[PDB]
Design a protein around this ligand. Structure first.
Ligand SMILES: O=C(CO)[C@H](O)[C@@H](O)[C@H](O)CO
Ligand SMILES: O=C(CO)[C@H](O)[C@@H](O)[C@H](O)CO
Ligand SMILES: O=C(CO)[C@H](O)[C@@H](O)[C@H](O)CO
Ligand SMILES: O=C(CO)[C@H](O)[C@@H](O)[C@H](O)CO
Ligand SMILES: OC[C@]1(O)OC[C@@H](O)[C@H](O)[C@H]1O
Ligand SMILES: OC[C@]1(O)OC[C@@H](O)[C@H](O)[C@H]1O
Ligand SMILES: OC[C@]1(O)OC[C@@H](O)[C@H](O)[C@H]1O
Ligand SMILES: [Mg+2]
Ligand SMILES: [Mg+2]
Ligand SMILES: [Mg+2]
Ligand SMILES: [Mg+2]
Lengths: 282, 283, 282, 283
């Protein structure tokens, strides 16, 4: 994945047929290169319809998800493997090139105590099996580090890399998110540095999930460090103008992040494209 | 109105028993602070006279802070919240504290999955009006600390805190901001200070990862410049989660160390904050 | 002045008839509230044409200059007074509301040692005379602090305020410039703080004189501090893009500051207006 | 190959005379820096055996820096520049210095009034080629420091510095950046580091007003993150003009104190920079 993309919560709450149409049409208005589609209810996704829309409008895609509690990999690894296999198949069927996000646990997952080796061992077994299935469908898997309040297992670039190393697959990458790094990284550039050998995808998300350029993220540090490590993967926006219901409780958007998609896309995407030009990103 | 620099004593003591109070006051003297913030996990157990004597002997000012336990969350159990707050207010006053602050309007862990409602805010306002009257009768103030979306769904920004203060209509409730929470919640960190400017009397100076101030993602120059520009008169209180007791830490989503040790946090973070306060004239 | 404006150097440094027309046309294109008119040669300005242009287009204006060497106030105060009187009359007659800039000296002053009381006494005598003339024509005067390399006399907000106190006039204000403050102020907000009782005008200029938003100025600190002191004066964008070479060389522009006007105005003005909205200056 | 932390000796002495050398070396030991950077502005006046003995006695490494005097500006008087640089290189080597850096291609305060020309750059390239051979004969390297538009019109950015190193084609010339200069010249400070990454061996960590690092407008987190990202392994050196060498004062434009004294800059600035280097995993 290359260039600029948008997580489709910018435009649709649910990836149903009307929502897919609405999101793809909106993406065309902004000349982005790809979209990121939530894979939160895999049997409900009409893959033939989404593939038709993507190919007609010359858009690339990937999918992302968080695991439902019934299938959290850390404690119910057999259910997690079965869920990920279905999500991988649907991602591949619609033409998506990867399945990323919190593929190792829940959005809002917490035991109340620090993560344990038994949990990480379960996650490793799940991701090893999922990565084999992904290879059979020709897609990659991404592991997104999220903040301490959304998951207790993988919060930093360094923890994400440790899991990629624990699994020992060749088709799992690290996915970072500036909103999460703004909380978790001891200096935001350190997350990028720690993840550099595996970093293929980054959510350029403002500190309050609003408009990039108008929060507390350290954008100049972020873009300088991406340029320094030779980043050439996907640059994707993530702003919860709409909230997918299956993850709303974990994402904690209790008030509007911005007025509407026109504001976030009209002000945020030019800011990010201009910063990528300024620091010479590949 | 607290003045100068202080510290939240969690780095030495979250259980304010007799040895814990001595340990915390000894730390405050070591680091030469102007005041301490005393956590009240269990208000009834506090020895008010021992603490009062310690503060007076050492010319240390203090305030107290807490969050409501689930049995007393104001949004849903306002009668129980009033009863909890009355005990904490009396203990604060009797030990010589000048205010009770923190998440006095709810608890860590509140989340409905939807936006806060008028019904919830009505209950919070009734609780804070009763608590404010009790605090007035004991000659202290109350502070409302805005915390981030994941800890509570009701008061996350300076502007929401001010709206609640206006809803209650008391004269002795102020806004308490926290740079760690503002780093998530405010649309530009200075905007929390700007929105709260008529009521801001206290700020937690905490790094973005609860570690060492100066070494994270908080915008310290914007924070201190904006405090100076609004003419901030109030407590500058350092807050770090280093050495917090495990069960408290886990409740605040601390799953891994926030910093190497106290010598990193206090040896690097306190001078950073004092230097910034001098730089921008807050001193 | 209130709202947003532009220093017209991007279209005109020589305020002749076609230059005035070109600048007012640009002001309307970018929907600004006011223009800052450079006065390289005050005697040559057609005051009636400019006044009619401003009035017809509902545009407000102020003027600015730096003193030429024959009239540097620190050493040639009588000549400085004569030069300022002519500029003040031209400003008032064209409908301008203030004369600002380096009205206390010139670009290129440098003794090699710290500024002296004798220098400051001559400047104060000049500004006292000029302020009285300005008052008789109904306009104010602004003192722009500029960096150490351009002039050795007034570099910080606090130095500007000390000169306002030394003169004792009631119609002189402080004019700050983010490009100069980025060098001179010990934390950029401190220039605004120190000048808070007298600050009525600010040049919003990137650190390299290029595109605001894309440099090393601390824009969030600048706008938050302006909001916090209750700033109600002019927000004026300044960029050296397309400056006439002669003038550019005198300001040490040895290479392009930006790609073109489309970059500077198309990226820079929205950035600044968005920041002003974000922090409630509007 | 300088490494670790060092200080430009204007922190402590206005001239590198015998009393000034003793003062500066003594102060450097008090702060446990790894090296000092000695101005080479009056080469025939430097007592090289005295400085060598002090450095060797106190286990301190050193390099030298300069700006060319107008009589020997390389862009217009290249033969004089070569003769001046040969003397400066010889004295640097005699006192045990490992490199000669700074504005070795022109003046501090050099200005024609118009943009730089190819003929000026041809002269500089010829000078630097000849100087680089002499430096190799004495076993030291040369550094080219980009400085801002008001101090020199020829080399202002990392990218311009690299273009000159490539033009000269000598393998013993490195790029030397300075955060005070990059704060003005680089379109985003990290771009200077990125542009110079193949040749960057030395950086002045100098605050935006030449005062205390951490208390100005330099983007330190961006600076340190980008240094770490490019694998920087050279010298990290402070530059604060507590004292002003007279031969460059007019060009450096320090008209008012940059800070209270050296105790304030070293006491607050060096720990800040060391802590940032640790934070981003340089040191
Ligand atoms: O940032 C995230 C959740 O905090 C993830 O990026 C998540 O939103 C997935 O995309 C769900 O589609
Ligand atoms: O920031 C806070 C919780 O997130 C509060 O400051 C908390 O630490 C309590 O009041 C502790 O007394
Ligand atoms: O910033 C400035 C010079 O450095 C001034 O603003 C200058 O542009 C003149 O006054 C222009 O009229
Ligand atoms: O930063 C500098 C001058 O602007 C340099 O470090 C200067 O010291 C010369 O290059 C050597 O003095
Ligand atoms: O693919 C075009 C279309 O409009 O997409 C949305 C879907 O609900 C509609 O049934 C279908 O006709
Ligand atoms: O002046 C700013 C401020 O918020 O004004 C109101 C006052 O209660 C506070 O002490 C002070 O910080
Ligand atoms: O090297 C020791 C010493 O003190 O350094 C300073 C120099 O002026 C003195 O002459 C010499 O004795
Ligand atoms: Mg994300
Ligand atoms: Mg707090
Ligand atoms: Mg200006
Ligand atoms: Mg330097």
């Amino acid at each position: 994945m290359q260039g600029f993309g948008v997580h489709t919560s910018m435009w649709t709450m649910n990836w149903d047929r009307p929502g897919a149409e609405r999101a793809v049409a909106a993406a065309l208005k902004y000349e982005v290169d790809f979209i990121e589609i939530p894979m939160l209810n895999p049997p409900a996704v009409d893959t033939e319809h989404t593939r038709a829309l993507l190919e007609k409008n010359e858009l690339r895609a990937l999918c992302s998800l968080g695991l439902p509690e019934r299938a959290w990999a850390s404690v119910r690894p057999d259910a997690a493997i079965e869920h990920l296999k279905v999500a991988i198949d649907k991602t591949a069927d619609l033409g998506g090139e990867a399945l990323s996000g919190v593929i190792y646990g829940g959005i809002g997952e917490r035991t109340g105590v620090p993560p344990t080796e038994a949990e990480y061992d379960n996650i490793a077994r799940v991701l090893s099996a999922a990565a084999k299935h992904a290879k059979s469908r020709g897609i990659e898997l991404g592991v997104e580090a999220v903040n301490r309040y959304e998951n207790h297992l993988i919060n930093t670039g360094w923890q994400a890399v440790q899991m990629i190393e624990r699994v020992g697959a060749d088709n799992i990458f690290v996915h970072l998110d500036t909103y999460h790094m703004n909380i978790e990284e001891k200096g935001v550039g350190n997350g990028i540095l720690d993840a550099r050998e595996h970093l293929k995808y980054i959510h350029l998300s403002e500190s309050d999930r609003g408009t990039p350029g108008y929060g507390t993220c350290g954008w100049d540090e972020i873009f300088s460090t991406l340029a320094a490590i030779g980043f050439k993967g996907g640059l994707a926006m993530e702003s919860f103008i709409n909230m997918p219901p299956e993850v709303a409780y974990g994402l904690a958007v209790w008030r509007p992040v911005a007025k509407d998609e026109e504001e976030v896309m009209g002000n945020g995407l030019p800011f990010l494209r201009n910063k990528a030009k300024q620091y010479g990103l590949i």
